[PDB]
């Protein structure tokens, strides 16, 4: 239009440019778009995106959603806000576990938000504020007996501290984020992979995941919140530079190429997800608000850096 403003090219979060980039990136990777829903998310959580690290995610699954996420600096009840805005059932059965988890340690945990371009509110992510004993997370009364039962299987693998938990609002499951004292080796990999029910992989799949883990490693476990079944596990490598990337699916290569990053220090994340329904690769990519800074503040370890958790080692 005859004096329509140019979308900025600088680093600072701009909401109108975000809307355009969500649309462009969904199109670029062949993902679905929900215009109205996307506008509702952007209106409800504008400040969260502005003040946190806003970033992208997808998986190598064909046609999978283009997701967009805020990692929070502004601490507030994002779940209540989601419900106010019409983005989440007020009767969702996972609300009780999310409130329990959020209320721990006198309310220290901080919620972040994970959305899909085609489907709206996807996940609520909880940073718990340090290395929490797995017990504290897996034995809140809101969790049924069959979920709390899994505690002992985790402790038996030396997966004894939890750093994050992410509730999936379509599937009444949670991804629980552990840090193990490593190095991660072949046998520890196999014992973790075995939880998923996935067919054992060839030796080079494992060798490659092991080459990209920090010494003290982060692994997410997908837990059905009714049955306690484990569907999936996922091993993460954070801030992998483009010239050091592992072998990736062409869909992930495309994603990393087309999704824009405006951060001073670019941040790509690669997850190797293994699961009974099929393996895949997850990718995340920085957009605005300094993803790397948030992750370092959480005491995450970056590819190529020392990767030793001293506090953890004093506890084990
Ligand atoms: C894990 O790698 C989990 C993880 C994965 C992606 C992002 O962005 C943050 C955290 C960890 O280091 O705790």
From Swiss-Prot:
<feature type="binding site">
    <location>
        <position position="284"/>
    </location>
    <ligand>
        <name>substrate</name>
    </ligand>
</feature>
<keyword id="KW-0637">Prenyltransferase</keyword>
<comment type="pathway">
    <text>Antibiotic biosynthesis.</text>
</comment>
<dbReference type="InterPro" id="IPR033964">
    <property type="entry name" value="Aro_prenylTrfase"/>
</dbReference>
<dbReference type="Pfam" id="PF11468">
    <property type="entry name" value="PTase_Orf2"/>
</dbReference>
<feature type="binding site">
    <location>
        <position position="163"/>
    </location>
    <ligand>
        <name>substrate</name>
    </ligand>
</feature>
<comment type="subunit">
    <text>Monomer.</text>
</comment>
<dbReference type="InterPro" id="IPR020965">
    <property type="entry name" value="Prenyltransferase_CloQ"/>
</dbReference>
<comment type="similarity">
    <text>Belongs to the aromatic prenyltransferase family.</text>
</comment>
<dbReference type="InterPro" id="IPR036239">
    <property type="entry name" value="PrenylTrfase-like_sf"/>
</dbReference>
<comment type="function">
    <text>Magnesium-independent aromatic prenyltransferase that catalyzes the irreversible transfer of a dimethylallyl group to 4-hydroxyphenylpyruvate to produce the ring A structure in the clorobiocin biosynthesis pathway. Clorobiocin is an aminocoumarin family antibiotic.</text>
</comment>
<keyword id="KW-0045">Antibiotic biosynthesis</keyword>
<dbReference type="GO" id="GO:0004659">
    <property type="term" value="F:prenyltransferase activity"/>
</dbReference>
<dbReference type="GO" id="GO:0017000">
    <property type="term" value="P:antibiotic biosynthetic process"/>
</dbReference>
<protein>
    <recommendedName>
        <fullName>4-hydroxyphenylpyruvate 3-dimethylallyltransferase</fullName>
        <ecNumber>2.5.1.111</ecNumber>
    </recommendedName>
</protein>
<keyword id="KW-0808">Transferase</keyword>
<dbReference type="GO" id="GO:0016765">
    <property type="term" value="F:transferase activity, transferring alkyl or aryl (other than methyl) groups"/>
</dbReference>
């Amino acid at each position: 239009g005859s004096h329509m403003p140019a979308l900025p090219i600088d680093q600072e979060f701009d909401c109108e440019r975000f809307r355009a980039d969500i649309r462009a990136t969904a199109a670029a990777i062949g993902a679905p778009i929900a215009h109205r829903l996307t506008d509702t998310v952007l209106e409800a959580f504008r400040d969260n995106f502005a003040q946190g690290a806003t970033l992208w995610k997808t998986t190598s699954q064909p046609g999978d959603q283009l997701s967009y996420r805020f990692f929070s600096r502004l601490k507030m009840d994002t779940v209540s806000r989601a419900i106010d805005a019409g983005l989440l059932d007020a009767a969702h059965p996972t609300l009780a576990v999310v409130d329990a988890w959020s209320s721990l340690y006198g309310g220290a945990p901080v919620q972040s938000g994970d959305f899909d371009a085609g489907r709206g509110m996807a996940k609520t992510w909880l940073y718990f504020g340090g290395l929490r004993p797995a017990e504290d997370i897996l034995t809140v009364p809101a969790l049924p007996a069959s979920v709390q039962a899994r505690l002992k299987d985790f402790l038996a693998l030396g997966l004894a501290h939890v750093r994050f938990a992410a509730v999936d609002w379509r599937h009444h499951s949670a991804n629980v984020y552990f840090r193990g004292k490593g190095p991660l080796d072949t046998v520890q990999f196999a014992r973790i992979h075995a939880l998923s029910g996935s067919t054992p992989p060839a030796a080079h799949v494992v060798e490659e995941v092991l080459a990209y883990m920090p010494e003290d490693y982060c692994v997410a476990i997908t837990l059905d919140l009714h049955s306690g079944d484990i569907e999936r596990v996922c091993f993460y490598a954070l801030k992998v530079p483009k010239n050091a990337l592992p072998r990736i699916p062409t869909r992930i290569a495309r994603f990393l190429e087309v999704a824009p990053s405006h951060d001073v220090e670019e941040c790509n994340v690669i997850g190797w997800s293994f699961g009974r329904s099929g393996d895949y690769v997850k990718a995340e990519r920085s957009y605005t608000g300094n993803m790397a800074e948030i992750l370092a503040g959480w005491n995450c370890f970056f590819h190529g850096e020392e990767g030793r958790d001293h506090d953890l080692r004093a506890l084990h």
